[PDB]
Design a protein around this ligand. Sequence first.
Ligand SMILES: [Ca+2]
Length: 122
Amino acid sequence: SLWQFGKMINYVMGESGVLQYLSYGCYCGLGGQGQPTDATDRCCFVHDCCYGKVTGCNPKIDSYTYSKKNGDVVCGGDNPCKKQICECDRVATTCFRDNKDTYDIKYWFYGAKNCQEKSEPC
Ligand SMILES: [Ca+2]
């Protein structure tokens, strides 16, 4: 669920993580539009696309199973669909981490109005 994505983000990125990430660029904040602004935004665009590939469960709402130990997250659980959601979230979180070097405050709470160009397709 996005509650867990948030927890995952805060675990991996620090407690400022949710606010840092979940209104970033054209895609962080979820169900975005337009063109990904940068690498971090592309993590979120990819994450949107990943959620779009989930069939059989609801990636926004459904609660999955994961373990957080020493800064890494590992998806598990007995429901493959929920594991798939967790994986979208884990990947995006690691993508944020990997691309922290180009995180640009310009895109923090960037605003939908700045993303009104044709959306990149999954
Ligand atoms: Ca998005």
